[PDB]
Design a protein around this ligand. Structure first.
Ligand SMILES: [Mg+2]
Ligand SMILES: [Mg+2]
Ligand SMILES: [Mg+2]
Ligand SMILES: [Mg+2]
Ligand SMILES: [Mg+2]
Ligand SMILES: [Mg+2]
Ligand SMILES: [Mg+2]
Ligand SMILES: [Mg+2]
Ligand SMILES: [Mg+2]
Ligand SMILES: [Mg+2]
Ligand SMILES: [Mg+2]
Ligand SMILES: [Mg+2]
Ligand SMILES: [Mg+2]
Ligand SMILES: [Mg+2]
Ligand SMILES: [Mg+2]
Ligand SMILES: [Mg+2]
Ligand SMILES: [Mg+2]
Ligand SMILES: [Mg+2]
Ligand SMILES: [Mg+2]
Ligand SMILES: [Mg+2]
Ligand SMILES: [Mg+2]
Ligand SMILES: [Mg+2]
Ligand SMILES: [Mg+2]
Ligand SMILES: [Mg+2]
Ligand SMILES: [Mg+2]
Ligand SMILES: [Mg+2]
Ligand SMILES: [Mg+2]
Ligand SMILES: [Mg+2]
Ligand SMILES: [Mg+2]
Ligand SMILES: [Mg+2]
Ligand SMILES: [Mg+2]
Ligand SMILES: [Mg+2]
Ligand SMILES: [Mg+2]
Ligand SMILES: [Mg+2]
Ligand SMILES: [Mg+2]
Ligand SMILES: [Mg+2]
Ligand SMILES: [Mg+2]
Ligand SMILES: [Mg+2]
Ligand SMILES: [Mg+2]
Ligand SMILES: [Mg+2]
Ligand SMILES: [Mg+2]
Ligand SMILES: [Mg+2]
Ligand SMILES: [Mg+2]
Ligand SMILES: [Mg+2]
Ligand SMILES: [Mg+2]
Ligand SMILES: [Mg+2]
Ligand SMILES: [Mg+2]
Ligand SMILES: [Mg+2]
Ligand SMILES: [Mg+2]
Ligand SMILES: [Mg+2]
Ligand SMILES: [Mg+2]
Ligand SMILES: [Mg+2]
Ligand SMILES: [Mg+2]
Ligand SMILES: [Mg+2]
Ligand SMILES: [Mg+2]
Ligand SMILES: [Mg+2]
Ligand SMILES: [Mg+2]
Ligand SMILES: [Zn+2]
Lengths: 50, 81, 119, 60, 101
RNA sequence: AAACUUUCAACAACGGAUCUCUUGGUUCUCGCAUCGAUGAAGAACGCAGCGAAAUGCGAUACGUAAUGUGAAUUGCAGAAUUCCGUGAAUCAUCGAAUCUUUGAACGCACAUUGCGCCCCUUGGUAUUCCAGGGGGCAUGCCUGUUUGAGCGUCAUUU
RNA sequence: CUAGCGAAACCACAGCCAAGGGAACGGGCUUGGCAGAAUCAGCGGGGAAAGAAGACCCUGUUGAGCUUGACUCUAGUUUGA
RNA sequence: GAUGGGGUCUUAUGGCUGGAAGAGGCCAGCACCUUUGCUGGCUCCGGUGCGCUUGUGACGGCCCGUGAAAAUCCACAGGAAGGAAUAGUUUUCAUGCCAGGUCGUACUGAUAACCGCAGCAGGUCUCCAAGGUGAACAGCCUCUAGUUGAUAGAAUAAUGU
RNA sequence: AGGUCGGGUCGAACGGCCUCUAGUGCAGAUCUUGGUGGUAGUAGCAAAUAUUCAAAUGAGAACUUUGAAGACUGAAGUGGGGAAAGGUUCCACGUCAACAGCAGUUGGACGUGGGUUAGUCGAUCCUAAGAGAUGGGGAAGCUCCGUUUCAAAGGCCUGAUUUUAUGCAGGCCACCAUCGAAAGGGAAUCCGGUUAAGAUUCCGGAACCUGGAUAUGGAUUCUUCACGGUAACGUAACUGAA
RNA sequence: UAUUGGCGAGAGACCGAUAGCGAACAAGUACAGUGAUGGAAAGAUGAAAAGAACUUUGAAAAGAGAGUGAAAAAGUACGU
RNA sequence: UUGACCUCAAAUCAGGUAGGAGUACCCGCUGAACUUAAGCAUAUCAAUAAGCGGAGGAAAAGAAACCAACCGGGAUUGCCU
């Protein structure tokens, strides 16, 4: 909603900061196992349930 | 009409976030959390909920203080330098 | 590089405060450059030096308070020992070694004797 | 336009601008950005020039 | 079998009385000293309708004998009581319609 | 007769079986006793030159101090004196600190980053108003202190 | 019908009939009739077509809902000490 | 204690003035890589109504239905106390000074932003509502605004809807 | 039952025999997990009246953009705003591997950034239905009842004092936690302009409310706390505690 | 004397990635549900990235060569 | 009048303590049913699971109001029986 609480807006801000791909220099580290962001979230496919 | 057209009438959340567990299990009318029992003093736990106990027991978090008591015991709760 | 705690420990608290506020000035001056330049690794040394100065200040003030409360009961709870709640609530060595005079008389009269057995 | 700690109010913002830059501030309007930080629009009096002091800070 | 309807009535969940539009409990004045040793005079300020009740109520105003104030009792209006009427309540009150002998 | 259908072989596909691996699990045995109102476990939100997560940490924020080792870290950039030294390191150790907002959670609340009160101090021509800074204000119970209440009750009065 | 995109049900193996016998109604077995690649659009005879371990009936020393003068109790209430 | 004559008041509302034409709107002319302007005018006076929508007023009808509470603010009764003369007393009159924190604020609100496993013909609360026909926010056509989205092409058999 | 050799592939461990041991041999269980077929390039992608022409971009245009034409929603709209809900979908730049059940140069997609400004709009305050501590009383107990109750339940103004702090001087007061409405109640803001995306919030102008300080003018007074009007009442003011 | 928890160790005629704890991996994670709860899948290039410079076709993805490597019958869709 | 005593209060009085977590084991309370009896009700499952309260490194128990019947033994706990 537009008139929202600060707790909800803070969780929304954290989700906006988390919604990003990998920094591609991480695939260059030795003994790297991470290929992509498996915890990626889109607003059309899954809801935060908050 | 008990299915798809009734699912369109669902826009009033029964549960919101609990302050103790951040869960979205805090019932807004009962004013109680369904998972941690807030605002009760004791944490909701059940021996039939062994998996839930395993999910929320000690060690599933940071242990900001309890990590170090073993080292302090091994050194004998020493002081100074 | 940064500052050194052993050479900061020689100074007074006013010099430490001046050092701290100019270090904060430099931290702001590097934060305004971090947006212009791609990378600015110099900011971490200033951040850790601020942390070191704050640590030294806290240690000096805490030692002053310890020497103020020296040699008396009821020192503050953050300054007295932490060990554990149970160990803090346990009996002292004195209170544990307290015995009645009857047991003391019995222990003096008949202590466990040291003896061997062949002849 | 400054980025401001989330615990600061307009009084603290105004006082700290007056201390750190020796500028008299007309008014302060703050918001909380969608990334979780706080932004402050600080309008100075007509005597001072924000353009004159911005490059004095080191950015323009 | 289930719990039947008259058995459910005693829990008082949805079977409580709807008391939003009621003026208060219609009680007599307390038997303090004046009503048992003499009389006291009040005045009917207004005769009003009470929701959920077939009889009209009457707001009688007395003076407090011990403090400078006005007390307002709610009587059930007797047939013939009008506004502005003086009600006399007590042992020495005269036998008239509205009195509390 | 081709095409098509079926069977077999080679090569190529599909898919992930088999084989060989293994910083993981499971079971047994031995030793030890160590959470918390001096604020635990847990949670939320943040913190890196370039990080989303895990791990670490708390506005001193992948950490500070102390001690030891003794020249790294590393994907890149950067820094060099940090290199015959009170001294590198995402090192080890850890006895000093910091420890946001919470949480048994403790000023009152809380689907609110809501609403107060007291002390000290600073500024606004201010005991009262506003604002900043610091420090506090829960309940039950124990010991003691002080102030009291009760023809419960004693003595002493005039 | 064409360009592009493109499932599902179902599937022992499959798929021409007559009679016989047969678990007494065969696509396969026996005896006959016959039988020629590959197919397209329809169609509803058959595939005892598909959909569900028949819901009717019976059995189970399997239940459950309900009823009562079934058996055994019981909350409550009543009477005495 | 009518009608009548003369007055008093509430200021919903409306009128004039200020705000305020300097704004905004409609035009004309001069211009120029250009920031692009600059300069002129005009913005006036009315009328109508079982009209639509909405607000309000005075009434009337209905009830075995008579149709919230508190915070908050003001007034009155009272007469406590304080009060002037070389001086005061007043800040419900006017002017003048300072400050007004915290959180939200974007966007959709649905034949694509919500819920239905989905970019689902379903469901999901409410405000504004032009002209004509016509009793009519019916049906049909149009203006402002908004779309022109839903796999398409060619033929025109049966059986379908 | 199986065993052995040859050939090919492969790259790191493995076998014969005598014994021991077992989570030891699969075709079925409408078996479990995973994968793959025929059906089959098949059913189908047919509601919501409808699209067409040229140019541009681009490797590529039935579908993108612009223009033109034709239409529709038809103000109980396919319009303009909001509530719940969602949470960055908003806007810009780049972009087409996947998604948009055709396509795609386009997009609510992908990548990178920007954006939400309030004394006056709301929340905050009040209380409603109701929820719910405390004093108490139940209950082995988790906890239950009850919300003014079998409570010793507190705070308000004036000051006085000017070791002075705020006690003592006094005086008044008896409600008796708190939570509960973004549609109830409620102090106060409008116009014009402005951005890619914000506005009753920003800029300009013009106001208003609350709280606090306060000085000047005005008013009133020697009849101390105003006058006028028959009156309804009037005014710039024109003490007023419990 | 007990001890399926915690801390620290040592072991096994145990299992060897559909097994073994649900979890050998950013696992009580992703995700579902209003909620209590439910709850996965997923290991292996090569000794070393030496991860294919460069030419050519293509709008591009890629292909064909060339090249690295013991081996591309190891090309980040990677052991067999 | 003054000073005690008793009882009961109030203090952001001085100094303390309790809560909660974990719970494999330990001390209690509470407390089933599936099941078996080839049915089923006592019984059994079981003085168990779930629920609640309370501890430690162990806890509990423990130095006889004991066992015995013998030529008597001699706190408690655990093993073999
Ligand atoms: Mg509903
Ligand atoms: Mg509800
Ligand atoms: Mg704001
Ligand atoms: Mg036949
Ligand atoms: Mg057959
Ligand atoms: Mg035969
Ligand atoms: Mg034949
Ligand atoms: Mg044929
Ligand atoms: Mg048919
Ligand atoms: Mg048929
Ligand atoms: Mg059938
Ligand atoms: Mg059957
Ligand atoms: Mg039988
Ligand atoms: Mg039965
Ligand atoms: Mg009977
Ligand atoms: Mg008249
Ligand atoms: Mg008006
Ligand atoms: Mg209307
Ligand atoms: Mg906004
Ligand atoms: Mg908006
Ligand atoms: Mg909108
Ligand atoms: Mg709407
Ligand atoms: Mg709309
Ligand atoms: Mg959806
Ligand atoms: Mg769903
Ligand atoms: Mg309308
Ligand atoms: Mg007409
Ligand atoms: Mg019409
Ligand atoms: Mg379609
Ligand atoms: Mg090898
Ligand atoms: Mg087996
Ligand atoms: Mg098989
Ligand atoms: Mg078989
Ligand atoms: Mg099968
Ligand atoms: Mg077709
Ligand atoms: Mg169709
Ligand atoms: Mg497509
Ligand atoms: Mg495509
Ligand atoms: Mg967009
Ligand atoms: Mg209660
Ligand atoms: Mg409230
Ligand atoms: Mg409100
Ligand atoms: Mg309102
Ligand atoms: Mg109302
Ligand atoms: Mg907008
Ligand atoms: Mg303005
Ligand atoms: Mg006058
Ligand atoms: Mg596994
Ligand atoms: Mg598994
Ligand atoms: Mg090879
Ligand atoms: Mg190979
Ligand atoms: Mg069993
Ligand atoms: Mg039986
Ligand atoms: Mg049986
Ligand atoms: Mg039975
Ligand atoms: Mg149990
Ligand atoms: Mg003991
Ligand atoms: Zn909770």
């Amino acid at each position: 909603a537009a008139q929202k609480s600060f707790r909800i807006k803070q969780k929304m801000a954290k989700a906006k900061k988390q919604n990003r791909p990998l920094p591609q220099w991480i695939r260059l580290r030795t003994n790297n196992t991470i290929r992509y962001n498996a915890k990626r979230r889109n607003w059309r496919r899954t809801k935060m349930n908050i | 009409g008990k299915g798809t057209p009734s699912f369109g009438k669902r826009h009033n959340k029964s549960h919101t976030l609990c302050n103790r567990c951040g869960r979205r299990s805090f019932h807004v009318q009962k004013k109680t959390c369904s998972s941690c029992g807030y605002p009760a003093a004791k944490t909701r736990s059940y021996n039939w909920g062994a998996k839930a106990k395993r999910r929320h027991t000690t060690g599933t978090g940071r242990m900001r203080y309890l990590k170090h008591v073993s080292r302090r015991f091994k050194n004998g709760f020493q002081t100074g330098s | 590089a940064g500052v050194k705690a052993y050479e900061l420990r020689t100074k007074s608290k006013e010099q430490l405060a001046s050092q701290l506020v100019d270090l904060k000035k430099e931290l702001a001056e590097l934060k305004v450059q971090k947006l212009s330049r791609p990378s600015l690794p110099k900011i971490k040394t200033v951040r850790k030096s601020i942390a070191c100065v704050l640590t030294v200040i806290n240690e000096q003030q805490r030692e002053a308070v310890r020497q103020l409360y020296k040699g008396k009961k009821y020192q503050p709870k953050d300054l007295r020992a932490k060990k554990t709640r149970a160990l803090r609530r346990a009996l002292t060595k004195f209170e544990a070694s307290q015995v009645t005079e009857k047991q003391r008389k019995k222990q003096i009269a008949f202590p466990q004797r040291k003896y061997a057995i062949k002849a | 336009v400054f980025q401001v700690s989330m615990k600061a109010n307009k009084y603290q913002i105004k006082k700290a601008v007056k201390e750190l830059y020796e500028v008299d501030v007309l008014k302060v309007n703050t918001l909380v950005r969608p990334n979780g930080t706080k932004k402050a629009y600080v309008r100075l009096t007509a005597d001072y020039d924000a353009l004159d002091i911005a490059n004095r800070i080191g950015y323009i | 079998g289930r719990v039947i309807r008259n058995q459910r009535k005693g829990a008082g969940s949805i079977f409580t009385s709807h008391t939003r539009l009621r003026q208060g409990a219609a009680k007599l004045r307390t038997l303090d000293y004046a009503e048992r040793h003499g009389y006291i005079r009040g005045i009917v300020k207004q005769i009003v309708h009470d929701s959920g009740r077939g009889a009209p109520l009457a707001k009688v105003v007395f003076r407090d004998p011990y403090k400078y104030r006005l007390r307002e009792e709610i009587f059930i209006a007797n047939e013939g009581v009008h506004t502005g009427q003086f009600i006399y309540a007590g042992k020495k009150a005269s036998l008239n319609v509205g009195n509390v002998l």
